[PDB]
UniProtKB/Swiss-Prot annotation:
Residues where Zn(2+) 2 binds: 9, 12, 25, 29
UniProt-recorded name of the protein: BCL11 transcription factor A
Function recorded in the entry: Transcription factor. Associated with the BAF SWI/SNF chromatin remodeling complex. Binds to the 5'-TGACCA-3' sequence motif in regulatory regions of target genes, including a distal promoter of the HBG1 hemoglobin subunit gamma-1 gene. Involved in regulation of the developmental switch from gamma- to beta-globin, probably via direct repression of HBG1; hence indirectly repressing fetal hemoglobin (HbF) level. Involved in brain development. May play a role in hematopoiesis. Essential factor in lymphopoiesis required for B-cell formation in fetal liver.
UniProt zinc finger (C2H2-type) residues: 7-29, 35-57, 65-88
Cross-linked sites for Glycyl lysine isopeptide (Lys-Gly) (interchain with G-Cter in SUMO2): 98
Section covered of the full-length record: 737 to 835 of 835
Gene: BCL11A
Length: 100
């Protein structure tokens, strides 16, 4: 039992406690949306994690994302580019990311 009609993020859709704390958090994330997927029940702070997982969401059959060359499950396509570019260059090593 409660009501909220103002003091909420235009991008989270989540109610808050003060319009300035609303403003500063809406800048310190940006991200996209409440990070929440509507097809998975998943969320994580980055921007491009969601826009990539969104455009890679097409009829995966399992309501969870996976590397279509492995069949191996992984949260988002940005972590897969970092898996694929090194977890497939030496044999299935300690997942140490695409970097220089
Ligand atoms: Zn927000
Ligand atoms: Zn999803
Ligand atoms: Zn893979």
């Amino acid at each position: 039992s409660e009501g909220r009609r103002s003091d909420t993020c235009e991008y989270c859709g989540k109610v808050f406690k003060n319009c300035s704390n609303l403003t500063v958090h809406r800048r310190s994330h940006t991200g996209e949306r409440p990070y929440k997927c509507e097809l998975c029940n998943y969320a994580c702070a980055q921007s491009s994690k969601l826009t990539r997982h969104m455009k890679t969401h097409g009829q995966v059959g399992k309501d969870v994302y996976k590397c279509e060359i492995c069949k191996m499950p992984f949260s988002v396509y940005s972590t897969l580019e970092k898996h694929m570019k090194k977890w497939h260059s030496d044999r299935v090593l300690n997942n140490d990311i695409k970097t220089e």
